[PDB]
Structure 1
Amino acid sequence: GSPVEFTLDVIGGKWKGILFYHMIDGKKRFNEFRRICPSITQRMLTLQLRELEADGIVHREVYHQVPPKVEYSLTEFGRTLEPIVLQMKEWGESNRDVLESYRSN
């Protein structure tokens, strides 16, 4: 399989990039992510986070009180994708206007 597509399968799709980006500056609770993406449904957020966890990119820390505290963070392995994610942010910011021109016809 293509290594480019292999990477995009880990970080691609509609939500993982956003989720990832917001963990760059530290751990987040589930409700913080819902405020970051008001159109994500709670089942879809849980699924996207489970897949990032399953791939070793995100750590899910559960505190054993009631109701339990749950915190999502980047693993060290996760952080190796940070340069690529930051480049996407920058390229997307820089090029939004010109992508819109090309699309405008």
Structure 2
Amino acid sequence: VCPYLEETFKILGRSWNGLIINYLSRSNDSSAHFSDMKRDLKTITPRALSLKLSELAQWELVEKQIISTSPVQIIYVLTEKGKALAEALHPIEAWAQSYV
């Protein structure tokens, strides 16, 4: 509980990760990504995007299912843990806006 939180923070602390599960929760229409726009533009290399998605996946936030190689089509759908984490996020997100 202690180092789970400290670690989750630390993940959240790193840059994309916070923004990514915003998308997964919000921009999704069926709680899956399918790499759409392979992200919406933004300042980020998919070298480092790919890195972050991996981090999410390792922390069971996200799961990936390769639908079809023959061409390769990849989802990136969010888990319960992830969904929940996004749900827990909302108050600190709100707070962040008050102080900025």
TM alignment of 1:92-103, pairs within 5 A:
92-96=96-100
TM score, norm. by length of structure 2 = 0.78
Give the aligned partner of residue 100 of structure 1: none
* Unmatched runs of 5 consecutive residues or more in structure 2: none
Amino acid at match of 1:29: F
Give, in whole Å, the separation in 2 of the partners of 1:33 and 1:15. Answer: 14
Give, in whole Å, the separation in 2 of the partners of 1:27 and 1:10. Answer: 21
Give, in whole Å, the separation in 2 of the partners of 1:21 and 1:33. Answer: 15
| Identical columns (%) | 27
**Number of residues of Structure 1 aligned to a counterpart in Structure 2:** 95
Divergent runs of 4+, >4 A? none
TM alignment of 1:31-70, pairs within 5 A:
31-35=36-40, 38-70=42-74
Give, in whole Å, the separation in 1 of the partners of 2:39 and 2:8. Answer: 25
Q: Is the 8 A contact 1:15 1:48 kept in 2?
A: yes
Question: In terms of Rg, which structure is larger?
Answer: 1
